[PDB]
Design a protein around this ligand. Structure first.
Ligand SMILES: O=P(O)(O)OC[C@H]1O[C@@H](O)[C@@H](O)[C@@H](O)[C@@H]1O
Ligand SMILES: O=P(O)(O)OC[C@H]1O[C@@H](O)[C@@H](O)[C@@H](O)[C@@H]1O
Ligand SMILES: O=P(O)(O)OC[C@H]1O[C@@H](O)[C@@H](O)[C@@H](O)[C@@H]1O
Ligand SMILES: O=P(O)(O)OC[C@H]1O[C@@H](O)[C@@H](O)[C@@H](O)[C@@H]1O
Ligand SMILES: OC[C@H]1O[C@@H](O)[C@H](O)[C@@H](O)[C@@H]1O
Ligand SMILES: OC[C@H]1O[C@@H](O)[C@H](O)[C@@H](O)[C@@H]1O
Ligand SMILES: OC[C@H]1O[C@@H](O)[C@H](O)[C@@H](O)[C@@H]1O
Ligand SMILES: OC[C@H]1O[C@@H](O)[C@H](O)[C@@H](O)[C@@H]1O
Ligand code: NA
Ligand code: NA
Ligand code: NA
Ligand code: NA
Lengths: 899, 899
C-alpha cells in the first residue's frame, strides 16, 4: 500500500481539497460578474459572451433544417425535422466528414472551402440542394456576436489554428466558400456554441434545464442569465443564454497557485501558449499528455520502470486520454495498463500498472473536481437569481471524456453535489449531440429572419439611389421650366409664382412696420423697426395668437375678422394703436400675384380649409376685415410667402443668399430668377424672386415612380388628396403619418406590438415632429425610446422600440434626400443662370422639422453636395422667423407705393 | 374682507396648497433624477449641467483677477484681489457698462465685440493691459461644458437673443472678438453660471454653503452633487456643483395643471415662447407683467376701476415688478399702489388700490412658494446624499427680486422651512454680487490651466508633423545608402547587412526541417515539414523553453549549452532523435555574414548580453555546443534574422512580398535589394535580402532633433546606452520606459499621484506591452483604466488615469509614426530603384507590440500611405512566427548546396 500512499505525496499538488475547491468557486463567481459588467468585461478572462438565445425549446419549433458541427471530436453534419402539427416527432439523420490535421492548421480558405464541399456532398446525397433549407452552425470556439447569424472568431482553441479567421466572421467566410463553388445555395441562419446547443437539446426534454456543459475535447459551460445582468445587451425584459467560455479561466494568472509544473509544461508545448489554462487542466485533449508528462518525470527519477525510459515515452501524445479511460475501468484497468505500458517499451511490472493507474486517477479526478468547482459557481448564480432557498434545475452535458471515462461522470456529480448541496441538480446527457438543440435554434432564428426579410423588403422602397435622386433633380428642373414658360405654365404643377421682390436688402430700408405670420405652426403679429445708415439696427416684437380649428376652417370673413381682431390686440399691446402703419402680410400659401400687394389664393395647403378664400385676393379679404371693425386703418403694402420672407431675413446680413427654404409643417423653396426667364411677367431686366411652391411636384404623377403604398394612404386620407404629393413626403405634418401607416401594417403582419393595433396607433397626428426628432436622437438608450413610446400611449417592448426607430429613420432620411434633390436642381439652375463653372450660394432655411430633427439638415446638405458638385451651398438657419425679411420687403413696397 | 375674498376666489388657481407644493417638490425631485440619468437626460427638461467646480473656496486662493458678468440685470466687469498673505483678504472694484437693446438682440458678433471693447476700456483705465491677469466669465445662461474653460450656449433665456451663439462656445466667440480688436490679450480661464458664482461667493464666508440660488431677472439654482450620481461625468470621486437650470422645469407640459391662462398669455408674448415656463411664474422679469395681464382681465370684467381701461394699462411692460414690490410695502403699499395706478390712466378708487395690492400678494407669494418647493426638493436630495436624519446647510442667494421685495424673502423662507422640517437652513445674501465667487473659481481654474499648459508643452515634443516625418524618411533613405556603399559602410549606423537570401520561395521547397527561434519574447525549437507540388502543405510543431537569468547573461558556452539541451529535449518530444536533420537558426541580433550559414554577432541588443558571444560566429558557437554534447548531431544550414524569416513566411503565400517588418520586443526591417546596390557583396546579378538593423538609426545623432529628455533617460539607463536609438522610440521593450519616465517627471512637478513617487513607479518594466495595450483600448472606461493601474501598485484617481492614458497614447503614436516614416523610406527606395511611378508591394509583419496594440498598426499604415503616396503597401500579419519562413530558407540552403 506504500506503492500508492507515496504517489499521493508526489502528486500532492494535484489533489485539491474541498477547502480549496471553495476558493476556486468563489473566484469564478467573481470572474462571472466581471465578464458581465461593461466596465470590467474588456479585462475579464471569462467573456460571458451573449448568445442571443432567449430560452429552451417549447415544442412550437417546426420545419426541416441542416446543422453543422465543427470544433469537436469530428466534423458532423446533421438534418433535423420536426412538426407537431402534422404530428411528426423529432427525427434526424447525420454523417461524419474526415478532416485532416493539415486543414485544421491551413488557411481559412482551405478549411471553409472544405466545409462548403462537405455541405455540398451532404445535400447531394439527399438531393435537397434545391430546397431552401435553413442552415444551423455549431461552432465550438468563442465568438463575438451582436446577432445570431454573425460569429466573429475571438480566438481558436483546442486543435484548430487556421490563418485568416480570428477577427473575421465565420458566417461571411463560409458563405464565401460556397459562393466560390456556385454548386448550391445555403441560408446560414445561426451560429451556436456546442454548450448552448447542448443546453437546448436537454431543455427540449426537460423544461428545468438552465445549463449547458461540454467536457470533451475542450471544456466550457453556458447558462440562462437574466437580461438585467447582461450589461453588454440592451434590455432587461426576460433572460438570455450566456456562453461563459470558462476555459480561459485564469489566463491572466488567476490560478497560478492551482497550476503545477506539469500544467506549465503542457502549456509550453500547446497550440495556444498561455491561453485556456483552466481548460488545459480539464478537457480530454490534455489529460492524456498530462499523465505522460508525470510519468516521464517519475521515470527519470526511477519511480517507475526501474527508471527505464524509451523514446516513445518521450514522444508527444504517445499517451491518450483513451488509455487514461482504459486504465480506470474496474475489471480490466490493470490488464489494459499492462498492454498500454508494454507497447511503450518500458518493462511494465504488475507494480507499474498499479502506479500508473493511480497517476491517471489523480489526474482525471482533478479535472472533474475543477469542473465541479466552477459549475458550483453557476448554480450559486441561478439560486441567487431566482431567490428560492433551494435551487432545482437540470444540467445538460456532452463530450467524449464525460461520455467514455468510467469514473469521471460518477465522481464529478458527487463532488458537485457536495460543494453545493443547497440544490437538487439533474444531469441529463445529450445523446443526439447538439443537432437537436441546434436545429431548435435555427427554427426560432429562421422564424425571426423571415420577419426581418419582409420588414427590410417593405422599407427597401423608401431607399433611393444616387441615380434615382439625380433623376428627381432632373424631373424637378424640367418641371421648373414648364412653370416659368408662358406656354406650358397653365398645366405645369410647379407653378413658379412671381413674388415681385426684385432684389435682396440694399441697406437703405428704414422705418417701423407691422407684420403678419400665418400658415406656419404659430400665427403671430409683429412690429419691426429697421434703422439704416452707418449704425443700422433691427428691433422686433411679436405675439402668438391661437386660431381655433373651428375658425381655421370656418368662413373667410370669420378667419380675417379673427386676424384683424388679433391685430387690434397687438396694437394695444405695443401701445401704438392710432397711426396708420404699413404692413407686410406673410401668408404661407400659393398665391397668384399681379403686384407686391395683390395675391389671389390659388388653393389651400397643409391644414387650412376656410371657405370662400380660394380665388380671392387675400389682401382684399384683409382690408375688408379691417373696414368691418372700423377701429383702425392700415396700409397693407405686401403679401409674402414664408420662403421669400426667409430669404430676405437672411439676405439682410448675408448678401450671398439668393434662395429660401422651408421645412416645417409644409415644405417649399424660392430663389432669384433672371427676369428674362420669368415669361409670366412682362420684362427681361434684372431679377425676381420666384415662389416655387414645389410641394405640388409629383401632382401630375411624375413621381408615382417612387411613391409607396404608405405615401398613397397618407395622400388619400388627407385634406387635399392628389395635391402637394412631394411635400407630403417631406414635411413635419406628414412624415409621422407615413410612419404610422408603416406601423399599422407591420402590426397587422404581427411584427410589432404583439400584433395588436392600439387605439392610440389609429389616432392620426400621433407622431409629431417633436416625437420623431426625439426618437432619432443619437445614442438614445432603448429604454428612453420605449419611454417615449409609452408616453404617446404605445405600450412597446425593446424589440418594438428598435423597429419603430428604424422606421422613423428610413422615412426621415428619404425626406432629407428628396428635399436635397430639389434644392440640388435649384442651385444648379442658378449656377447656369450666371454661366459659372462653380457657384457659391447660401440658402435661408426655417421650419420646426429642420430645427428639431437631428439628421434631416445633415443628410439634406450631404445630398445637395453630391447631386450638385459644381455648387458649394451654405445653409443658414433663421433664428428670428420670417419677420425681418417680411419687414425689409414691406419697406421696398412702401418706396414703390410712395413712388 | 369682501374685497380680498372675491379676488382670492378669482385667482384661486394661483394659491398653492402645501399638498400641492409637496406635489411639485416631488416632481422636481424626479426631474433632477432624470436630468442626471444618462438614459433620460436627453429628454429631461431640467438639464442638471456639470459645472466643473469641485468645491467651495478653501481659502487657499490668491491672485489678481478680472471677472466678467453678463446675462443679469446689468453687464459688469470687476477686479478681485485676494491674499491670505496680504491680509487684504478680499478687495474688489467694479464697473457697469450700459448694454443697449440692439446689442442684446443683435448678432453674437456685435454682442461679443461690445464685450471685448468694454473689457478694453476697463483695462485701459486701470493701466493693466500689460499684466497677464486671469479672466473669469460669469455667463448666466444654460451651457454645455466638458471642462471649466468651455461654454457652449444651449439656449438664450431672459432678455437675450443674439444670433449665432446657440450651439457655439462663447469662450471662443469672446477670444475671437478680442483677437479682432488687437488692443490686448485675454486669458479667459473659466466660465460660470451666476448661481455657481453666488454659491462660491457665500461659500467663502460660510463653509456650510452647498447651494447657489438666484431670483432676479431669471431664477435658477445650483448645488453640490455626489460625483457618483452624475452619469454624464465619468468619475465617482468627490462632488461637483450641478447647475440645475430649473427654469425649464415643466417645459414638457409637466406643470400644465399648475400654469394658468395668465401664464399661457405671458408666454405667447415672451421672447422665448414655450420655454422657461417655470421661471416665467417666478423671476422678476415676469411677475410684473403677469400682474398687468390680470388687472387688464379684471378691468375688462368690471371687477376694477368701473371697468375702465386706458392704453397705458394695456401696454406691455407698463407694470414693473418694481411696482409690485413698492405696492407690497407695509408702510406705503396702499399709498404706492395709488400713485402707480393713477399714472396708468385709471381712476384708482381706494378699494382698487387694495384690490390690486392683493393681486400682487397672490402672484409674489406664488413665486416664493414655487421656489420653496424646488429648493426643498434640492435640500431633501442633499440629505439623502449624506444619509442622515437631519441636515444643516447654507444657501447663498442673489437677485433683484429677492433683494428688493418687502415680503418675498420672509414668505419664501417660511414656506421652505415648513416643507423641509428636519433641516436647518441659513440664507446668506450676497451683497457684493457673484464676483468674489467667480474670482475664487478663476483662481483654481488658472492654477489648473497652468498645469495643463506645462503638460502639453512637454507632450508637444512627441508631436511630429508631416514635414518632420518626411524629413525622417529622407534621413532614413540617406542612411540606407551609406550602409550599402562600402565607401561609407564602416561608419554607417544602419548597417544594411546582407542575409545571403537571394529569392523569395519558388514553390519547390520540400522536406523536413528543424528551426530555432532566439531573440523574441520566447525562445523555442521548431519542427517543420514542407511538402510541395500536387497539393502543397506545411505541418509544424514547436515547444517554448525558458532561458534562466543565470543563462541569458552568463557566458556563451552556458547559453548555447542550454540551447543544445532544449534541442535534444525537443527531438525527444517529437520522437525524432537519431537522424542528422538540417536546421534553421533564427537569431535576431545583428550579424555580419559571409555565407548563409555564417553569422558574426556584431553586438547584443534588447535584453541579451551573454559574454564571449559578440564577435563570434553564432553558428560556430552552436556547433561547438552540439559537438560537446555528442548526444546527437545536426546540420545547421542557415542563420536568419527574424525580419528576413517573417518576410519569407509571408512571401510563401504572397508573391509581391519583398519586405519584412518587426515591431515586437525590438524593431527592425528587411527588403529585396538589387545586388548592383549591395556594394558589400561581389555581384550585380539578382537580388539580395538586406537585413537593415534600422534600430540603430539615430545612433550617429541624426535624430537628436526629435529625441526628447525622456528618450535620453531611457537610452542612458539601458544595457546598450547610446545604441539602437530609433528602436528605443518604437519597440515594446522601451515605450513603457518612456511613459514611466514622463510620469515620474509629472509627479515631481505635482501633476500626478499627489506628488508621491511610489516605489512601483520607480520599478522599470511596470508598463509592459500587454498593459500599454489595455490602457489605450477604445471606449474603455475610466474606472477600467484606474482598475488596471491599481493592479500595478499605482494608487490613482480618475484624473490620474486620464493623464496616464493620454501620455501612453502620445508615446505609442510617435512610435507608429516614426516606424511609418522608416517603412516609407524603404518601400519608396524599391519604387525608385525599379524606375516605377507607382509600386504595389506587401510587407510581412510580426511582433507582440504590433499584434496587441489597438492603434499602432492603424496609425503606422496610415503614415506609410501618407509619406509614400506613390506606393500601395499591404501588411500581412504572420500568425505563426518566423518558423515557416526560416524552414523555407533552410530548404534553399540545402538545395544550393547539393546543387
Ligand atoms: O469534442 P467532443 O469530446 O466529442 O465533445 C464536444 C462535442 O460533443 C459532440 O457530441 C457534439 O455535441 C459537438 O457539438 C460537441 O462540440
Ligand atoms: O411650419 P413651421 O414648422 O412653423 O415653419 C414655417 C414657419 O417658420 C416660422 O419661423 C416663420 O418663419 C413662418 O413664416 C414659417 O411659416
Ligand atoms: O437678475 P439680477 O437682478 O441682475 O440678479 C442676478 C445677478 O445678480 C448680480 O448681483 C450678479 O451677482 C449676477 O451674477 C447675477 O446674475
Ligand atoms: O519580440 P516579439 O514581441 O516576441 O516579436 C518578434 C518575434 O515574433 C515571434 O512570433 C517570432 O516570429 C520571432 O521570430 C520574432 O523575433
Ligand atoms: O468544444 C468545447 C469548448 O471548447 C472550448 O475550448 C471552446 O472555447 C468553447 O467554445 C467550447 O464550448
Ligand atoms: O409653409 C411652407 C410652404 O408650405 C406649402 O405647403 C405652402 O403652400 C407654401 O406657400 C409654403 O411656402
Ligand atoms: O441669471 C439667473 C438664471 O436665469 C436663468 O433664466 C438662466 O437660464 C440661468 O442660467 C441663470 O442662472
Ligand atoms: O527582434 C526584432 C529586431 O530587434 C532588433 O533590435 C534586432 O537587432 C534585430 O536583429 C531584430 O530583427
Ligand atoms: Na442588459
Ligand atoms: Na419675364
Ligand atoms: Na459617475
Ligand atoms: Na554587389
Amino acid at each position: 500500500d506504500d506503492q500508492v500512499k507515496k504517489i499521493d505525496k508526489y502528486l500532492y499538488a494535484m489533489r485539491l481539497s474541498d477547502e480549496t475547491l471553495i476558493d476556486i468557486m468563489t473566484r469564478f463567481r467573481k470572474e462571472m460578474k466581471n465578464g458581465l459588467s461593461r466596465d470590467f468585461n474588456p479585462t475579464a478572462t471569462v467573456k460571458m459572451l451573449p448568445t442571443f438565445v432567449r430560452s429552451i425549446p417549447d415544442g412550437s419549433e417546426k420545419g426541416d433544417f441542416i446543422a453543422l458541427d465543427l470544433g469537436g471530436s469530428s466534423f458532423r453534419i446533421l438534418r433535423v425535422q420536426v412538426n407537431h402539427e402534422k404530428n411528426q416527432n423529432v427525427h434526424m439523420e447525420s454523417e461524419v466528414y474526415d478532416t485532416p490535421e493539415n486543414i485544421v492548421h491551413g488557411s481559412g480558405s482551405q478549411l471553409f472551402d472544405h466545409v462548403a464541399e462537405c455541405l455540398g456532398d451532404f445535400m447531394e446525397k439527399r438531393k435537397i440542394k434545391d430546397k431552401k433549407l435553413p442552415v444551423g452552425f455549431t461552432f465550438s470556439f468563442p465568438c463575438q456576436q451582436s446577432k445570431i447569424d454573425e460569429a466573429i472568431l475571438i480566438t481558436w482553441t483546442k486543435r484548430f489554428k487556421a490563418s485568416g479567421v480570428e477577427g473575421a466572421d465565420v458566417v461571411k467566410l463560409l458563405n464565401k466558400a460556397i459562393k466560390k463553388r456556385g454548386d448550391y445555395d445555403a441560408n446560414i441562419v445561426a451560429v451556436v456554441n456546442d454548450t448552448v446547443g447542448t443546453m437546448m437539446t436537454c431543455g427540449y426534454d426537460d423544461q428545468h434545464c438552465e445549463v449547458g456543459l461540454i467536457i470533451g475535447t475542450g471544456t466550457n459551460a453556458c447558462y440562462m442569465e437574466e437580461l438585467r445582468h447582461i450589461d453588454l445587451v440592451e434590455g432587461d425584459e426576460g433572460r438570455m443564454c450566456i456562453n461563459t467560455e470558462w476555459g480561459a479561466f485564469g489566463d491572466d494568472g488567476s490560478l497560478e497557485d492551482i497550476r503545477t509544473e506539469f500544467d506549465r509544461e503542457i502549456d509550453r508545448g500547446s497550440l495556444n501558449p498561455g491561453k485556456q489554462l483552466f481548460e488545459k487542466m480539464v478537457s480530454g485533449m490534455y489529460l492524456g499528455e498530462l499523465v505522460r508528462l508525470i510519468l516521464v518525470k517519475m521515470a527519470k527519477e526511477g519511480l517507475l520502470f526501474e527508471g527505464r525510459i524509451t523514446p516513445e515515452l518521450l514522444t508527444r501524445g504517445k499517451f491518450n486520454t483513451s488509455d487514461v479511460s482504459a486504465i480506470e475501468k474496474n475489471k480490466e484497468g490493470l490488464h489494459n495498463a499492462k498492454e498500454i505500458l508494454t507497447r511503450l517499451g518500458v518493462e511494465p511490472s504488475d507494480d507499474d500498472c498499479v502506479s500508473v493507474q493511480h497517476v491517471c486517477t489523480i489526474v482525471s479526478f482533478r479535472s472533474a473536481n475543477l469542473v465541479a468547482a466552477t459549475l458550483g459557481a453557476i448554480l450559486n448564480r441561478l439560486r441567487d437569481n431566482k431567490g428560492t432557498p433551494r435551487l432545482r434545475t437540470t444540467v445538460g452535458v456532452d463530450g467524449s471524456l464525460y461520455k467514455t471515462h468510467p469514473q469521471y461522470s460518477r465522481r464529478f456529480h458527487k463532488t458537485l453535489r457536495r460543494l453545493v448541496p443547497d440544490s437538487d441538480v439533474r444531469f441529463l446527457l445529450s445523446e443526439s449531440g447538439s443537432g437537436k438543440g441546434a436545429a431548435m435554434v435555427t427554427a426560432v432564428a429562421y422564424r425571426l429572419a423571415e420577419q426581418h426579410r419582409q420588414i427590410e423588403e417593405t422599407l427597401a422602397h423608401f431607399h433611393l439611389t444616387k441615380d434615382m435622386l439625380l433623376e428627381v433633380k432632373k424631373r424637378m428642373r424640367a418641371e421648373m421650366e414648364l412653370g416659368l414658360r408662358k406656354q406650358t405654365h397653365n398645366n405645369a404643377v410647379v407653378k413658379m409664382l412671381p413674388s415681385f421682390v426684385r432684389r435682396t436688402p440694399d441697406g437703405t430700408e428704414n422705418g417701423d412696420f407691422l407684420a403678419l405670420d400665418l400658415g406656419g405652426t404659430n400665427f403671430r403679429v409683429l412690429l419691426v423697426k429697421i434703422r439704416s445708415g452707418k449704425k443700422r439696427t433691427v428691433e422686433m416684437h411679436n405675439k402668438i395668437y391661437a386660431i381655433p380649428i373651428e375658425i381655421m376652417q370656418g368662413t373667410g370673413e370669420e378667419l380675417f375678422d379673427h386676424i384683424v381682431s388679433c391685430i387690434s390686440d397687438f396694437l394695444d399691446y405695443m401701445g401704438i394703436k392710432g397711426p396708420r402703419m404699413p404692413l407686410g402680410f406673410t401668408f404661407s400659401f400659393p398665391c397668384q400675384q399681379t403686384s407686391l400687394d395683390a395675391g389671389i389664393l390659388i388653393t389651400w395647403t397643409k391644414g387650412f380649409k376656410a371657405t370662400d378664400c380660394v380665388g380671392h385676393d387675400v389682401v382684399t379679404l384683409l382690408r375688408d376685415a379691417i373696414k368691418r371693425r372700423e377701429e383702425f386703418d392700415l396700409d397693407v403694402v405686401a403679401v409674402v410667402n414664408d420662403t421669400v420672407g426667409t430669404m430676405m431675413t437672411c439676405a439682410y446680413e448675408e448678401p450671398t443668399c439668393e434662395v429660401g427654404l422651408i421645412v416645417g409643417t409644409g415644405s417649399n423653396a424660392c430663389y432669384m430668377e433672371e427676369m428674362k426667364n420669368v415669361e409670366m411677367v412682362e420684362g427681361d431686366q434684372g431679377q425676381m424672386c420666384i415662389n416655387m411652391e414645389w410641394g405640388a411636384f409629383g401632382d401630375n404623377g411624375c413621381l408615382d415612380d417612387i411613391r409607396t403604398h404608405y405615401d398613397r394612404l397618407v395622400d388619400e386620407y388627407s385634406l387635399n388628396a392628389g395635391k402637394q404629393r412631394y411635400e407630403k413626403m417631406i414635411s413635419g405634418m406628414y412624415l409621422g403619418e407615413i410612419v404610422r401607416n408603416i406601423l399599422i401594417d407591420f402590426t397587422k403582419k404581427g411584427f410589432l406590438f404583439r400584433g395588436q393595433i392600439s387605439e392610440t396607433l389609429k389616432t392620426r397626428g400621433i407622431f409629431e415632429t417633436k416625437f420623431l426628432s426625439q426618437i432619432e436622437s443619437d445614442r438614445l438608450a432603448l429604454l428612453q425610446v420605449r419611454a417615449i413610446l409609452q408616453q404617446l400611449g404605445l405600450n412597446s417592448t425593446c424589440d418594438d422600440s428598435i423597429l419603430v426607430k428604424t422606421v422613423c429613420g428610413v422615412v426621415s432620411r428619404r425626406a432629407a434626400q428628396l428635399c436635397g434633390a430639389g434644392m440640388a436642381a435649384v442651385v444648379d439652375k442658378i449656377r447656369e443662370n450666371r454661366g459659372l463653372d462653380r457657384l457659391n450660394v447660401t440658402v435661408g432655411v426655417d421650419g420646426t422639422l429642420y430645427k428639431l430633427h437631428p439628421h434631416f439638415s445633415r443628410i439634406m446638405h450631404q445630398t445637395v453636395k453630391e447631386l450638385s458638385p459644381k455648387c458649394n451651398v451654405s445653409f443658414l438657419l433663421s433664428e428670428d422667423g420670417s419677420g425681418k425679411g417680411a419687414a425689409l420687403i414691406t419697406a421696398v413696397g412702401v418706396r414703390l407705393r410712395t413712388e
